[PDB]
């Protein structure tokens, strides 16, 4: 199944006063922001080439809290600042989606444009009908996958299914974590989706040539002090503090080899290991994965290496490591 490795995602947060209601254990808005910080960090950790943008909608107006960027810390700071937001007004799906569409219209065709609307207040007061905007969204192939809160909104249901996204409603906080963690992963590319080669640039960390001879002093490029060494660009030739980042001049993505390598596990998903409770002639008391005695009647095995893994080993392998230790051999 074709997958879009590079995706520009907009997490549309609503500053409705329905968010004031403390349905969850803490305030709803505070919980959403606290978990969305984790979502942002994990999304960047699972898709370095991708970038994210936050639009906060309240009082019938949508404001770009943070533009598209490759730096998780800046977005995290924006979330922490927004934690104290007043949270009064009424959202406008038309306004939010129009802002997202305006920013995403000029984005490259190859990248997957995606929107995740964390809908809290079921109402949607908009200057213009949203069914018309749905047509433009379908034309622009911008995937929109709403996540409703305490409501199965019909307009958002049709939005999701027509635009190709998925609709969900929060059963509880634990299920909210699961929903956002699921949305972290790249979505499969459908027939409407198209792939195209994208120019990429690989910089190399550089320092003073020899005892600060013919040095290359520079401060930064988006109170930066002088830097003896740092990253550079093949074309900008402008010092960059951290990678990966889009060029401020070229418009070309600067990214190192490990960042790309971080996404190969998506292309290579791990086949689920059959769960057999009984020992099944497994005379090895120690679990091969962790070399620990199997204290539970559960075993996992591959179709190639035919090794033995306990519950923790299998869960960790399929969750984070994304590869079978013994089966690597």
């Amino acid at each position: 199944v074709r997958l879009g490795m590079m995706r520009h995602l907009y997490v549309v947060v609503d500053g409705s006063r329905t968010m004031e209601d403390q349905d969850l254990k803490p305030n709803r808005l505070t919980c959403t922001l606290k978990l969305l910080e984790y979502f942002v960090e994990e999304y960047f950790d699972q898709n370095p080439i991708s970038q994210i943008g936050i639009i906060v909608t309240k009082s019938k107006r949508a404001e770009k809290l943070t533009e598209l960027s490759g730096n998780p810390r800046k977005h995290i700071t924006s979330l922490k600042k927004a934690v104290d937001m007043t949270c009064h007004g009424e959202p406008s799906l038309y306004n939010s989606l129009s802002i997202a569409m305006q920013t995403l219209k000029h984005m490259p065709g190859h990248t997957s444009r995606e929107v995740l609307i964390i809908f809290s207040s079921l109402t949607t007061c908009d200057p213009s009908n949203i069914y018309d905007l749905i047509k433009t969204l379908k034309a622009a192939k911008i995937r929109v996958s709403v996540i409703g809160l305490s409501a199965e909104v019909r307009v958002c249901t049709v939005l999701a299914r027509e635009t190709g996204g998925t609709y969900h409603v929060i059963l509880d906080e634990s299920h909210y974590k699961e929903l956002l963690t699921h949305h972290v992963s790249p979505p499969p590319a459908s027939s409407s989706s198209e792939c195209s080669l994208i120019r990429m640039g690989f910089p190399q960390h550089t320092i003073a040539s020899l005892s600060d001879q013919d040095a290359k002093p520079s401060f930064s490029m988006a109170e930066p002090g002088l830097t003896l060494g740092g990253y550079f660009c093949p074309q900008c030739r402008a010092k960059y503090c951290e990678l990966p980042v889009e060029c401020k001049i070229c418009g070309l993505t600067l990214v190192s080899a490990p960042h790309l390598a971080r996404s190969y596990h998506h292309l290579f998903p791990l086949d689920a290991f059959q769960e057999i409770p009984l020992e099944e002639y497994n005379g090895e008391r120690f679990c091969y994965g962790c070399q620990g005695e199997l204290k539970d009647q559960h075993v996992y095995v591959c179709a190639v290496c035919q090794n033995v893994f306990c519950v923790d080993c299998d869960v960790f392998v399929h969750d984070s490591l994304h590869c079978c230790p013994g089966c690597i051999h």
Binding site: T123, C125, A151, E152, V153, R154, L171
Partner: protein, 185 residues
């Protein structure tokens, strides 16, 4: 009675808060206004605004209309539906039934109320297994006779634990039940 309750809520601030939380529509005797209000109510249900449709149990709208998924999700019954005890036509209809076929006047009156309530509250389960809750804001329904005369399918689901929930407890259990029904099969 609906007009009196609406007027009292308007004098108090409850009605304005309800308007803020969700759109409010009301039924009237005139069929044209009823149809227009219901047409707008359907669009409100489709959109995220939502709608609160106040109607009368004997209203032709109640019998004609059918509520399905994402339509009339929570059916609220304000008071046991009883016809006015002054309309002399029902007096003949009722005392004649007492004289012949031997039906108690109170028995037939409660039957006429329970049948009407079941008619006007049984729409949410139309088909396709679409979730929905039926809340009856009246302690009279808690009486054994009303429960017994209630249809079997609703009554068996009904339990003593939730029989006489307070307003707040009913709200909490409704929220929890909606949470449970939100998730897929």
């Amino acid at each position: 009675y609906m007009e009196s309750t609406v007027a009292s809520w308007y004098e108090q601030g409850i009605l304005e808060n309800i308007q803020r939380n969700k759109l409010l529509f009301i039924e009237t005797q005139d069929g044209a206004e009823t149809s227009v209000a219901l047409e707008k109510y359907q669009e409100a249900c489709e959109n995220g605004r939502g709608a609160i449709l106040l109607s009368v149990a004997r209203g032709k709208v109640s019998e004609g209309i059918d509520f399905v998924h994402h339509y009339g999700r929570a059916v609220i019954m304000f008071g046991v539906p009883y016809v006015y005890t002054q309309s002399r036509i029902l007096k003949a209809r009722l005392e004649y039934l007492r004289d012949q076929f031997q039906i108690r006047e109170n028995d037939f009156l409660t039957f006429d109320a329970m049948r009407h309530a079941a008619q006007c509250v049984g729409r949410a389960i139309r088909g396709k297994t679409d979730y929905g809750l039926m809340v009856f804001a009246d302690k009279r329904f808690a009486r054994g006779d009303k429960r017994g005369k209630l249809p079997r399918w609703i009554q068996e689901h009904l339990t003593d634990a939730n029989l006489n929930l307070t307003v707040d407890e009913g709200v909490q259990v409704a929220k929890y039940f909606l949470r449970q029904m939100a998730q897929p099969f």
